[PDB]
Amino acid sequence: FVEMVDNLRGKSGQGYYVEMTVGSPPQTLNILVDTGSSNFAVGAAPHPFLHRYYQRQLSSTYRDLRKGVYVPYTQGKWEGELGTDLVSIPHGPNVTVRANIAAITESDKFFINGSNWEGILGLAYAEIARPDDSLEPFFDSLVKQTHVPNLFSLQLCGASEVLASVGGSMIIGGIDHSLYTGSLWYTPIRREWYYEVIIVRVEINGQDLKMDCKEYNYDKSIVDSGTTNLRLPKKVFEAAVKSIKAASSTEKFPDGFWLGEQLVCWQAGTTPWNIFPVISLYLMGEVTNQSFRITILPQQYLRPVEDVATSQDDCYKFAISQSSTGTVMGAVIMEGFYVVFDRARKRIGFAVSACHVHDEFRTAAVEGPFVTLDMEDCGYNIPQTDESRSHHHH
Numbered sequence: 001f002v003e004m005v006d007n008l009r010g011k012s013g014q015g016y017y018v019e020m021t022v023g024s025p026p027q028t029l030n031i032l033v034d035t036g037s038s039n040f041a042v043g044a045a046p047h048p049f050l051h052r053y054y055q056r057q058l059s060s061t062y063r064d065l066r067k068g069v070y071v072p073y074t075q076g077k078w079e080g081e082l083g084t085d086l087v088s089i090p091h092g093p094n095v096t097v098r099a100n101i102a103a104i105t106e107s108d109k110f111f112i113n114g115s116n117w118e119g120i121l122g123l124a125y126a127e128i129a130r131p132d133d134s135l136e137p138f139f140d141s142l143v144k145q146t147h148v149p150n151l152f153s154l155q156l157c158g159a160s161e162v163l164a165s166v167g168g169s170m171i172i173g174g175i176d177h178s179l180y181t182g183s184l185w186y187t188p189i190r191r192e193w194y195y196e197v198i199i200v201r202v203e204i205n206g207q208d209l210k211m212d213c214k215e216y217n218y219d220k221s222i223v224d225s226g227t228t229n230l231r232l233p234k235k236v237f238e239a240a241v242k243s244i245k246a247a248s249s250t251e252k253f254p255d256g257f258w259l260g261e262q263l264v265c266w267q268a269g270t271t272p273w274n275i276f277p278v279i280s281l282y283l284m285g286e287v288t289n290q291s292f293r294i295t296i297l298p299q300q301y302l303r304p305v306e307d308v309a310t311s312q313d314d315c316y317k318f319a320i321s322q323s324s325t326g327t328v329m330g331a332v333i334m335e336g337f338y339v340v341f342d343r344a345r346k347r348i349g350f351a352v353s354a355c356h357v358h359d360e361f362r363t364a365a366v367e368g369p370f371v372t373l374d375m376e377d378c379g380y381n382i383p384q385t386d387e388s389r390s391h392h393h394h
């Protein structure tokens with residue numbers, strides 16, 4: 001899988017992208033690797049934040065589906081026109097696929113200035129594809145049309161006038177053993193829509209938050225490479241910040257820091273890492289009543305940002321933030337670990353990443369099993385709206 005190592009790039013906090021080609025002749029574009037969505041969509045007209053964009057008219061293999069599409073998120077939205085074309089990943093498997101492509105004609109707060117990506121590769125399942133689940137996602141087409149095994153794995157590696165460059169690997173169709181150390185532990189995919197998982201316990205420096213475990217998964221928990229932060233439901237976020245504040249309390253930061261709105265700095269090389277606690281998320285195991293924990297360091301949840309003003313200092317942003325749409329294990333979580341999206345066996349694997357940032361006292365960890373007697377169900381059941389209920393699924 002050596003051709004696929006180091007096939008991701010980006011700027012810290014602005015997303016990890018893979019180079020792709022679309023059309024004949026091939027048009028090169030940088031595409032955000034997003035496990036939190038299910039569309040393949042590309043800028044297809046001019047925009048202040050785009051260096052370039054997909055030109056449908058210039059591809060001999062383009063076919064128009066004569067259907068539009070709209071995709072809104074909490075943060076960002078876009079629209080455009082559906083088609084199919086030939087798609088390749090130059091630093092990926094040596095194959096070409098005909099895939100659905102949404103050509104983005106208008107957007108708001110979607111593209112990011114300086115991020116260097118021009119589209120989004122949604123790697124999650126058909127159930128959350130827009131406009132509906134009959135629009136086959138890219139990965140589904142790749143698997144149906146070629147020999148590629150139904151699995152991919154991600155190694156996201158964390159980091160004065162520009163943000164820090166980041167790198168990573170998307171291994172399509174298998175697992176590369178150079179990218180991790182130790183044991184690979186799996187948590188079941190609860191339902192194939194998002195990459196939904198179940199968190200059963202949360203500890204901050206070995207201390208249990210002691211919430212009803214449904215709170216951890218209210219209203220869902222997902223793994224999303226296209227989200228920067230670890231995002232936590234309001235109640236959990238408040239409890240967690242209260243605990244990190246207590247552990248770190250020899251230092252008094254502004255409110256803005258804990259809201260993710262302000263940097264805090266120390267003299268170059270003097271950051272007191274050991275005043276900030278590790279955070280452990282216990283995930284449901286493949287075996288009933290078992291779990292395993294993934295443990296991240298402050299080196300994951302404190303994001304480095306060079307201050308043009310005091311570029312003499314090491315400065316950081318707090319990258320845990322509040323959610324009202326459940327837990328999101330974003331790049332903060334993922335940068336600890338080699339993460340295996342084992343779609344074939346409806347599971348997600350975690351192992352300690354060979355590239356994760358740590359120090360000489362602590363490492364990110366993946367440890368199990370931990371066993372419980374008579375587990376409560378920690379899953380939440382989203383209220384069924386009449387809209388969603390009325391959908392037929394043929």
Ligand SMILES: O=C1Nc2ccccc2[C@]12CCNC2
Nearest residue numbers: 036037073075076110226227
């Ligand atoms: O919710 C989001 N808003 C946004 C904006 C731009 C790119 C990617 C995204 C996501 C889509 C799913 N993962 C993150």
Ligand SMILES: [Zn+2]
Nearest residue numbers: 391392393394
């Ligand atoms: Zn019907």
